[PDB]
Amino acid sequence: MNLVLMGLPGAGKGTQGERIVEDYGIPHISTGDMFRAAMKEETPLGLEAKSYIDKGELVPDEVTIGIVKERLGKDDCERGFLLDGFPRTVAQAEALEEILEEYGKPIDYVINIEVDKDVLMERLTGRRICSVCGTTYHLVFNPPKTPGICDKDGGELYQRADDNEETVSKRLEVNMKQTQPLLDFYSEKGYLANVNGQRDIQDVYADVKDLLGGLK
Ligand SMILES: Nc1ncnc2c1ncn2[C@@H]1O[C@H](COP(=O)(O)OP(=O)(O)OP(=O)(O)OP(=O)(O)OP(=O)(O)OC[C@H]2O[C@@H](n3cnc4c(N)ncnc43)[C@H](O)[C@@H]2O)[C@@H](O)[C@H]1O
Ligand SMILES: [Mg+2]
Numbered sequence: 001m002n003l004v005l006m007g008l009p010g011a012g013k014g015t016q017g018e019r020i021v022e023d024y025g026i027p028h029i030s031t032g033d034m035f036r037a038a039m040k041e042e043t044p045l046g047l048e049a050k051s052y053i054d055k056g057e058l059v060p061d062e063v064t065i066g067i068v069k070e071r072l073g074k075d076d077c078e079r080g081f082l083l084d085g086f087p088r089t090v091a092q093a094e095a096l097e098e099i100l101e102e103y104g105k106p107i108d109y110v111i112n113i114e115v116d117k118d119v120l121m122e123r124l125t126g127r128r129i130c131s132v133c134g135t136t137y138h139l140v141f142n143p144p145k146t147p148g149i150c151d152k153d154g155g156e157l158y159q160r161a162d163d164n165e166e167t168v169s170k171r172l173e174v175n176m177k178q179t180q181p182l183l184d185f186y187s188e189k190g191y192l193a194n195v196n197g198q199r200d201i202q203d204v205y206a207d208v209k210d211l212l213g214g215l216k
């Protein structure tokens with residue numbers, strides 16, 4: 001089960017991925033999460049990536065591809081993996097092709113979670129994340145039972161630094177111009193799957209799960 005999750009900022013990659021990992025147990029590989037973890041530990045990678053992430057810009061291809069290549073080679077990817085937020089440029093897609101060719105783990109499906117750009121600002125500014133487990137909530141669409149705290153572990157929730165109007169706008173701008181070329185790239189390969197992401201979380205996952213049967 002080799003999967004790629006793609007979608008505009010806030011479309012629900014992390015939300016849907018959390019459901020996939022629970023049902024199948026494949027590693028959830030999010031480049032965004034990897035960069036932020038690096039930013040927290042203040043590693044050289046983290047500091048370099050921060051400049052781009054804080055502005056809502058894409059981190060350069062070379063360094064991004066490098067960390068994904070190493071990640072996909074780990075033992076936990078033996079039965080499959082879930083890429084989240086990578087690739088997000090045709091160049092990264094072409095690089096991944098070579099990487100998976102080397103590992104002998106070609107992509108089964110590229111799942112595009114389609115959501116109108118006009119509703120994503122609301123999805124992100126209203127997002128609140130658990131500082132302990134990283135699961136996401138939304139003040140309106142999926143609120144925690146007790147405001148400010150995680151339903152699972154009681155951890156304090158926060159708002160990601162880049163989820164402000166200005167940066168969200170840049171993120172949408174930067175990723176929107178990369179969207180059609182990526183869709184065309186995978187449509188040509190014959191394994192692009194489009195899912196309507198503008199429905200309730202479990203309804204979206206129902207369609208996502210419909211694509212996962214028979215992948216080992
Ligand atoms: N490959 C790469 N190359 C170069 N640079 C890279 C890179 N990868 C990462 N980067 C850098 O890292 C930065 C951050 O990357 P990243 O963390 O990947 O940013 P992102 O792509 O913008 O995605 P998000 O995490 O913000 O949203 P999501 O789709 O996972 O949504 P979620 O499930 O939380 O949902 C959002 C909200 O909506 C709610 N929600 C979810 N589903 C629904 C639903 N069905 N209905 C209503 N609300 C919902 C949630 O509760 C939540 O509040 C980038 O901007 C870039 O700078
Ligand atoms: Mg995410």
Ligand SMILES: [Zn+2]
Nearest residue numbers: 130133150153
């Ligand atoms: Zn939590």
